[PDB]
């Protein structure tokens, strides 16, 4: 089928009924939110939202009788988790795209871009070491590795010179850890606060041979077509399902006493993000077309910002 996410019909106190793609005032308001909020606060909203979408937290009794299992983390290893898997894929792509658009569109000066880049890495650090949200941690890391972000030479140089510690933390700690996750070793290299949401993406993608991803990452080609790596994720998936509860356990501990900020909560919604990016009409075009669109838009903004 398709995603459960139906953006054209999503309502919000924070979104005009009829919005166009990348509305400038709305990208303005978004940036301001992430700009004016502490990275831990941002990461708590992301984790909290990821737990709803993956059905680790907030599962009504109707939803559970409906799944046949207690947790979405069990459900995704099963045939009837197909919808969930597709939802998981859409939110990840949309989130990675938004991050990129946040560096390449929601900024004015070089210094503003670099500050944004640092804030993004701090958020990623919070996701990893505090929230143990490996899933959204990976979406941010994917944004940072996009060819359109990677080639912003002047911007990475400003990061190296002004935000040095953050820049070294990213290259020396985050990148290598990211790589471990991708080789399917997450179960043996847990961050200091354990795991609340697993990486998910490479497992969900292996299962969904018809999955579209932005810029075609986790497409299991070339050096990825390794039985060894595929075994690691699938062995890990099975462990995930049997131990699904431990994740809930972690997320509940981390989020005890958490009180969400309404607007912040809204902008974490994939639906909302989809409306921001493709508008109230285009938000329901096919994945391939929607993703190809931003590949073009991001390459153009990157070129406008730092020409060769």
Curated annotation (Swiss-Prot):
Description of how the protein assembles with itself and partners: Part of a complex comprised of PTPRA, BCAR1, BCAR3 (via SH2 domain) and SRC; the formation of the complex is dependent on integrin mediated-tyrosine phosphorylation of PTPRA. Within the complex, interacts (via SH2 domain) with PTPRA (when phosphorylated on 'Tyr-798'). Interacts (via Ras-GEF domain) with BCAR1. Interacts (via Ras-GEF domain) with NEDD9. Interacts with PTK2/FAK1. Interacts with PTPN1. Interacts (via SH2 domain) with EGFR (when tyrosine-phosphorylated).
Highest rank taxon of the organism: Eukaryota
Compartment(s) where it occurs, according to its Swiss-Prot or TrEMBL record: Cytoplasm; Cell junction, Focal adhesion
UniProt note on tissues of expression: Ubiquitously expressed. Found in several cancer cell lines, but not in nonmalignant breast tissue.
Misc note: Overexpression confers anti-estrogen resistance via RRAS-independent activation of the PI3K pathway, and activation of the cyclin D1 promoter in breast cancer cell lines. Plays a role in insulin-mediated ERK activation and DNA synthesis in breast cancer cells.
Functional note: Acts as an adapter protein downstream of several growth factor receptors to promote cell proliferation, migration, and redistribution of actin fibers. Specifically involved in INS/insulin signaling pathway by mediating MAPK1/ERK2-MAPK3/ERK1 activation and DNA synthesis. Promotes insulin-mediated membrane ruffling. In response to vasoconstrictor peptide EDN1, involved in the activation of RAP1 downstream of PTK2B via interaction with phosphorylated BCAR1.
Organism expressing this protein natively: Homo sapiens
Ras-GEF domain span: 38-308
Processing and modification events after translation: Phosphorylated on tyrosine residues.
Transmembrane segments: none
Gene transcribed to yield this protein: BCAR3
Domain remark from Swiss-Prot or TrEMBL: The SH2 domain mediates interaction with tyrosine-phosphorylated proteins. However, not involved in the binding to phosphorylated BCAR1. Required for cell cycle progression in response to INS/insulin. Required for regulation of EFR-induced DNA synthesis. The Ras-GEF domain appears to adopt a closed conformation rendering it incapable of carrying out canonical exchange factor function, this closed conformation is probably required for interaction with BCAR1.
Region named Mediates the interaction with BCAR1/p130CAS: 234-238
Annotated site location: Required for interaction with NEDD9: 238
Full protein stretch here: 511 to 818 of 825
UniProt protein name: Breast cancer anti-estrogen resistance protein 3
